[PDB]
Symmetry: D3
Subunit: 48 residues, 6 copies
């Protein structure tokens, strides 16, 4: 079987993997930010 299409599949899979890794990072930051805001609200609930 062809090394050539095998190589483009290597590229394709790597691209997908990076998209996976990227999407995980963004969602992580989203939750990190909204979690910080929530934890802040908590301190201003037990005080005001």
């Amino acid at each position: 079987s062809s090394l050539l299409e095998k190589g483009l599949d290597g590229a394709k899979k790597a691209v997908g993997g990076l998209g996976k890794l990227g999407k995980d990072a963004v969602e992580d930051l989203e939750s990190v930010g909204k979690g910080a805001v929530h934890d802040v609200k908590d301190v201003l609930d037990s005080v005001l």
Copy 2:
């Protein structure tokens, strides 16, 4: 109503918006990369 929780909502919404903007960017790149690989396969279909 309180400026304070209003401000944390400002932060929360901004965080969500950035997560939206971020997720759009990643998905765009994913498709850009897999599209390039596909278009390359096309040239190596009409030739080999």
Copy 3:
């Protein structure tokens, strides 16, 4: 290279773009609705 597969790629990309545009719209409405409910809860926190 073939206009034909080039055209089907035109269709494919347009379909993907619409799916992108569509998914953005739904998520926007989701957040719009849940944001309204949250802002309502806020008024019934500073009052009751």
Copy 4:
């Protein structure tokens, strides 16, 4: 417990459910469109 926050939760959950239903619809159409393009490519593979 309060009927009021219970009601806003009713609204919130309904909004989420609609977002779910909506996202499912968009993704379905995405795949329907890209599937049609693929099946078309198949006929123009076994012929040209």
Copy 5:
């Protein structure tokens, strides 16, 4: 047209459908869990 690629498309579509069904299940559980935590917070708001 070929039964063979027709069959692999059968497999592909079934795989996608399972991924759809799976993603729906996970998101459902996510919301079920976070909804339970929210409803619990409600009881400890009207009491403490």
Copy 6:
């Protein structure tokens, strides 16, 4: 600050984390399945 809401946040975050872990698993399997079908198509391209 209250151990109680701190604990429910522990639960909430754990639930979200599981949803993350779950969604990653489903998407992984989706791609594993569609990748296998693609690699099979490749062998039936270089032969038939």
